Amino acid sequence: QCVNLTTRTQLPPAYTNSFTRGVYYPDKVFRSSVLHSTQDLFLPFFSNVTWFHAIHKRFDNPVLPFNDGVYFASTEKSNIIRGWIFGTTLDSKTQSLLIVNNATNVVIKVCEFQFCNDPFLGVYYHKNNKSWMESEFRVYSSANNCTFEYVSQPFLMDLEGKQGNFKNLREFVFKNIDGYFKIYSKHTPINLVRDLPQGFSALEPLVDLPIGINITRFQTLLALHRSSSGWTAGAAAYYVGYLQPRTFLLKYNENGTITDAVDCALDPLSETKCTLKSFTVEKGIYQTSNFRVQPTESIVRFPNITNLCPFGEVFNATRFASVYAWNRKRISNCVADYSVLYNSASFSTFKCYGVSPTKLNDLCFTNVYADSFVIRGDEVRQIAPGQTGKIADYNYKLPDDFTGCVIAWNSNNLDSKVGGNYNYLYRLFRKSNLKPFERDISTEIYQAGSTPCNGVEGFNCYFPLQSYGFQPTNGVGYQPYRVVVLSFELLHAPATVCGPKKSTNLVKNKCVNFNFNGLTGTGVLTESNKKFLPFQQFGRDIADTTDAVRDPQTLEILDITPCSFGGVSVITPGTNTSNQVAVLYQDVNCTEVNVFQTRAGCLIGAEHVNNSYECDIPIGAGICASYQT
Amino acid sequence: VQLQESGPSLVKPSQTLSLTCSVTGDSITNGYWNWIRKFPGNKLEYMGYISYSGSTYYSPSLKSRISITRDTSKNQHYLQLNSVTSEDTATYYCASDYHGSKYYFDYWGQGTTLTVSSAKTTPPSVYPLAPGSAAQTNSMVTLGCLVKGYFPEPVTVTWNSGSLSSGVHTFPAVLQSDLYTLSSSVTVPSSTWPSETVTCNVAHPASSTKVDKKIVPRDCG
Amino acid sequence: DIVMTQSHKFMSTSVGHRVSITCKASQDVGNDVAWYQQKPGQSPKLLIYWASTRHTGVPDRFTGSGSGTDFTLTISNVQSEDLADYFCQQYNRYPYTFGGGTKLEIKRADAAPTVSIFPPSSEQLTSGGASVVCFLNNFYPKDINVKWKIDGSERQNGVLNSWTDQDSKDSTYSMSSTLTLTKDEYERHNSYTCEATHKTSTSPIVKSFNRNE
């Protein structure tokens, strides 16, 4: 369970290549003498497949992923490879598929099996009367919540270790699409020593298991034969591939057996076969695909670092008003860049409420107002959503959904006089509460008791507009703070100023995606020789084709050049004559992609010969190709 | 500048808290006075403040429950808490805030524990822990002094009336169903035992009980 | 109030390395970022004020920066005197809203612990009480198991564990273990011992005595 085998030799996971492995039957449709294509999880030709061992010097049990599709090719001569382990993370946290073979039946159970660190099989008591009977079963630990159980036909498998070369080949195809498990199997006698053959074979399905679970990691089970860490294995090999959603050609005979497969993405010789949907291709030049240059960078330019709102003059002014008769400043037609206010290092009291400050820059609000006033330092907490006091209920009431900020700084040497500053006033008493964002400049005499005031003072008649008290020799927190309240509001009106334009630097002279303030698309920004107008934005062609752009505040005229595109024509010989092909793209050059430049494109794969011969394969512009010794 | 708390450690509910955190190191000329309790489990919460000029301002959460005063004569401050309950059991800290030479200064106290409970007091049973002579031989020896059966928290357990500090490890109590259990260890050399005797001094501020038990190696020669 | 949300509640570092505490505040505080310095067993102290100026008496090995919300305290050249719980808060206006809390752990070399177990005194047997206390001081780390082995049998009844903070003098740990038992449960056994398995050795330190003297 937790004890691992100490007979493991360290080896790096080297890779190898296959020739035509990974082709199976995609469906159960019987066809005769046709060549049709299909799109499924296939193993592409000349792929980097793994190179593992199943011997006693190097005994390794690696874990490979499963979500990308794998191909399982394994050679066997002494019945060492028995089954496999399927699961999500190789644990008993969920249901897992386990298909084992104890030489009697094919046990396929879907339970919550407790997988160990290194599960393996072993045969014990090889002294007298061995008979190759298994005794140690260390595959799983427990079983709970089973949903499927299948028992195959009983048989007898000889577990005797055979000597010599390989005798059997067991190649499997494992895939999982939307929980529907599919298993392909193939068995054929072979004669191998170390590696996989360079041949072709097809696979047939055996059973269908509609389980409905996801498999991400898997591990191959191996058996050992020892004559708990001194177990020795036999002699076997197994390769793990990687499936890709490719398209192959299926050459059907009169019996429906695939004899050869053609990849449409391996070599340009085989790409011509997928166009004509046949194996025998005559001498000539045919189109295979289309060339296209993918963009690698998005282009977003700026208009200028100017046209900013005066945050250094509004939020740093000298003359302000009172808390009840404050001056409301209108903010419109600017760029609300808050980069100079967050790291200004000049505000002793800087706090924001409501939401995150990163969300305020990515979300645009409608009403952006500034409420600046000078108050004392005892009731600064009352400027907050959900507060009570002489400011939030008598001077300046804030709504509960306040997402603004509070900006203040030390002004002990600016708004403080010796003897008391009586320039600003504040409301003390009121008959009731206020409204959110409400101005009250009334001079009504408050009546505390039952005695009427009649506009003048008297018994229980105090003046509500009292004066502030400022002192330079007062406390360090009771200094007058020039609090500038920034109001935020989101309504059905269109938003005006919340810093809309956020971009960066731009590149040019590449196949990129330009995105300006008035034109977007895809094109190469090359040099131009035209003459533009200072109020224009871009230019178009006759038949509605954008082919020119202009910088906002830079004297630079650029055109919209299309990238390298066009069809892919491959010159291919006959199937029984030669196999050398050339790469020829249309409407390109030999710089943006045996190299020669023609009028139709760049010809790569043909050596230029000054001798003029007979035109056998046409290319274009008086250039032809031939097959010389 | 280091403050120091003082006062009782057991206040009955529906009463008035009476604590005193003195100021040592700086006279009361300019600054403020804060009071922040510490919940068990590394949690803090602001309560209120009062300036040195005579201006009072309280928290909007606890309006009529926070009442902190000042005293510029004896350089001390009083800490009162109105409408106490069982949720006010926390570690009280007194702090000050003052500026100077365009710098920000923030100093704190030492720490006190106040527990509000309406249950009756329990006298502690201080029992000594004398090591045996048939124990395992070692170059270093320890002395023990266990207090069992006291209520409520907290207490003040030290060694030699606070004068001993070499290897003194003060450990808190363990929360049982009804009682508590103390433990203390002092690293002493092996040449002192059993020639020298160290007396543990455990004080119970919740019931004004001070029991001194001398660790005597009974029986002596 | 300002919610000072932290990323982790406890971090560990060694002597001579660099540690960093990430405290992402949900509300904007600007450049007014404050930090604390809480010695274990004492009150917290002011360490860094206004995120660019150090306190009087603090060396220049404590730096700090940030922009908006991503505030990370950079601590380089960690010494033995840097054992403190760094808290992130704001000093804009009253009240001073504080954060959750981050406990810093200082790593150093191994040390030999001290295990001692005491028999009950004659005054406890006269009244009818008994108390067996196991000790474990100057040990590392704190993730240990203190089990009682009374005559080779494991007993979990009456076992009291009390873990304390890291000491600020030698960067070690200190705890205790008291076994609650009566006089009838004391005379039925003879040998009392307690062991503590540490990472310094595979065999735990044993300590036994004899009540017959």
PDB file of N, CA, C and O in Angstrom, chain A residues 387, chain B residues 45-47 58-66, chain C residues 1:
ATOM      1  N   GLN A 387     -24.059  57.130   9.758  1.00  0.00           N
ATOM      2  CA  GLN A 387     -23.521  57.797  10.934  1.00  0.00           C
ATOM      3  C   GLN A 387     -24.531  58.804  11.466  1.00  0.00           C
ATOM      4  O   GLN A 387     -25.410  59.280  10.743  1.00  0.00           O
TER       5      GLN A 387
ATOM      6  N   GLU B  45     -10.642  45.882  18.736  1.00  0.00           N
ATOM      7  CA  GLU B  45     -11.810  46.722  18.495  1.00  0.00           C
ATOM      8  C   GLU B  45     -11.626  48.043  19.225  1.00  0.00           C
ATOM      9  O   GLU B  45     -11.310  48.053  20.419  1.00  0.00           O
ATOM     10  N   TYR B  46     -11.829  49.147  18.510  1.00  0.00           N
ATOM     11  CA  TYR B  46     -11.696  50.473  19.098  1.00  0.00           C
ATOM     12  C   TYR B  46     -12.921  50.799  19.942  1.00  0.00           C
ATOM     13  O   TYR B  46     -14.049  50.439  19.593  1.00  0.00           O
ATOM     14  N   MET B  47     -12.695  51.492  21.058  1.00  0.00           N
ATOM     15  CA  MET B  47     -13.757  51.848  21.990  1.00  0.00           C
ATOM     16  C   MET B  47     -14.022  53.345  22.052  1.00  0.00           C
ATOM     17  O   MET B  47     -15.165  53.777  21.876  1.00  0.00           O
ATOM     18  N   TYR B  58     -17.163  59.925  21.538  1.00  0.00           N
ATOM     19  CA  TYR B  58     -17.314  58.487  21.699  1.00  0.00           C
ATOM     20  C   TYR B  58     -17.625  57.827  20.360  1.00  0.00           C
ATOM     21  O   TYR B  58     -17.893  58.489  19.354  1.00  0.00           O
ATOM     22  N   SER B  59     -17.582  56.497  20.367  1.00  0.00           N
ATOM     23  CA  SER B  59     -17.871  55.696  19.190  1.00  0.00           C
ATOM     24  C   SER B  59     -19.374  55.668  18.918  1.00  0.00           C
ATOM     25  O   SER B  59     -20.180  55.673  19.853  1.00  0.00           O
ATOM     26  N   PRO B  60     -19.780  55.651  17.643  1.00  0.00           N
ATOM     27  CA  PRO B  60     -21.216  55.551  17.336  1.00  0.00           C
ATOM     28  C   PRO B  60     -21.815  54.189  17.643  1.00  0.00           C
ATOM     29  O   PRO B  60     -23.040  54.089  17.783  1.00  0.00           O
ATOM     30  N   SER B  61     -20.998  53.138  17.750  1.00  0.00           N
ATOM     31  CA  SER B  61     -21.516  51.827  18.122  1.00  0.00           C
ATOM     32  C   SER B  61     -21.838  51.764  19.611  1.00  0.00           C
ATOM     33  O   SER B  61     -22.907  51.284  20.003  1.00  0.00           O
ATOM     34  N   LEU B  62     -20.926  52.245  20.449  1.00  0.00           N
ATOM     35  CA  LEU B  62     -21.114  52.300  21.899  1.00  0.00           C
ATOM     36  C   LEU B  62     -21.199  53.776  22.283  1.00  0.00           C
ATOM     37  O   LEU B  62     -20.186  54.421  22.560  1.00  0.00           O
ATOM     38  N   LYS B  63     -22.422  54.308  22.297  1.00  0.00           N
ATOM     39  CA  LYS B  63     -22.618  55.731  22.552  1.00  0.00           C
ATOM     40  C   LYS B  63     -22.523  56.052  24.040  1.00  0.00           C
ATOM     41  O   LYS B  63     -21.667  56.836  24.464  1.00  0.00           O
ATOM     42  N   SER B  64     -23.396  55.453  24.848  1.00  0.00           N
ATOM     43  CA  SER B  64     -23.459  55.732  26.276  1.00  0.00           C
ATOM     44  C   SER B  64     -22.759  54.673  27.117  1.00  0.00           C
ATOM     45  O   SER B  64     -22.932  54.654  28.339  1.00  0.00           O
ATOM     46  N   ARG B  65     -21.972  53.795  26.495  1.00  0.00           N
ATOM     47  CA  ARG B  65     -21.254  52.760  27.225  1.00  0.00           C
ATOM     48  C   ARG B  65     -19.790  53.099  27.470  1.00  0.00           C
ATOM     49  O   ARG B  65     -19.199  52.564  28.413  1.00  0.00           O
ATOM     50  N   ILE B  66     -19.199  53.967  26.655  1.00  0.00           N
ATOM     51  CA  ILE B  66     -17.797  54.348  26.788  1.00  0.00           C
ATOM     52  C   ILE B  66     -17.731  55.673  27.534  1.00  0.00           C
ATOM     53  O   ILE B  66     -18.323  56.669  27.103  1.00  0.00           O
TER      54      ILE B  66
ATOM     55  N   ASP C   1     -16.207  51.862   8.829  1.00  0.00           N
ATOM     56  CA  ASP C   1     -14.973  51.177   9.194  1.00  0.00           C
ATOM     57  C   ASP C   1     -14.245  50.660   7.958  1.00  0.00           C
ATOM     58  O   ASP C   1     -14.850  50.474   6.902  1.00  0.00           O
TER      59      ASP C   1
END
